Ligand binder design. Sequence first.
Ligand code: NAP
Ligand code: MTX
Length: 206
Amino acid sequence: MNQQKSLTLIVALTTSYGIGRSNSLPWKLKKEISYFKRVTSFVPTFDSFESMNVVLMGRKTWESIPLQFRPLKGRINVVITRNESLDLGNGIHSAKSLDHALELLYRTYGSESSVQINRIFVIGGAQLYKAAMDHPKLDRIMATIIYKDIHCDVFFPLKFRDKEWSSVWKKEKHSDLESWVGTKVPHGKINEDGFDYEFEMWTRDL
Ligand SMILES: NC(=O)c1ccc[n+]([C@@H]2O[C@H](COP(=O)([O-])OP(=O)(O)OC[C@H]3O[C@@H](n4cnc5c(N)ncnc54)[C@H](OP(=O)(O)O)[C@@H]3O)[C@@H](O)[C@H]2O)c1
Ligand SMILES: CN(Cc1cnc2nc(N)nc(N)c2n1)c1ccc(C(=O)N[C@@H](CCC(=O)O)C(=O)O)cc1
């Protein structure tokens, strides 16, 4: 009713868990952003008829996305916001929280609907990551790790890759990565504009 699907989080962070700086991305990765697109837009062909995935984001992230690329094309876009008097959108929903966002969707995209949801993604920011991380339906993390310690002022809320969470978070094999995002993905490090990064998939039991 409120929670049918599992939540998936997608983030890019430095080894020190930094995700932002000056309400921006401390970096510029063309291939990192294309993987983003790919992962969150992908829906099985046979189902490519009826379905769309969901991109849930907080207000600030929405404001950061190049206005030329907003709304995210091909995905159900939902902005999380308390102070929502006049959201701006032509069928771009607003919701006062993740749980409210989940019942909104579950109420709009019902059997009535010609449009049905496939997967649901939390794309940021720090603040929504924090709510997602505590949600009882969050079971997968789509993370891109950057091997540079760039200066950030925004950090990811749980050190999911540290020994302390090793009995809860498990890092899946790459072959498993590709099986889920339904495509061959670069393995090992990619270097761009001097940055060395890598794609990983972390799961947890609920
Ligand atoms: N590294 C990455 O992958 C990644 C992805 C996205 C963003 N970022 C970065 O993260 C930073 C922005 O961080 P942020 O924490 O300020 O932004 P954010 O979550 O995008 O925006 C926070 C705003 O969203 C709303 N919000 C979020 N969670 C809410 C909840 N549970 N209930 C109600 N409202 C909620 C509030 O909006 P109202 O004021 O509208 O009520 C709050 O001011 C920047 O560095 C941005 O670049 C990084
Ligand atoms: C600021 N921001 C948040 C952002 C950026 N990179 C991320 N990277 C990952 N891996 N995960 C995230 N959650 C993420 N979030 C952005 C900024 C731009 C676009 C964006 O324009 N995306 C286009 C891609 C355009 C392109 O290929 O050049 C899209 O259609 O998805 C998305 C999110």
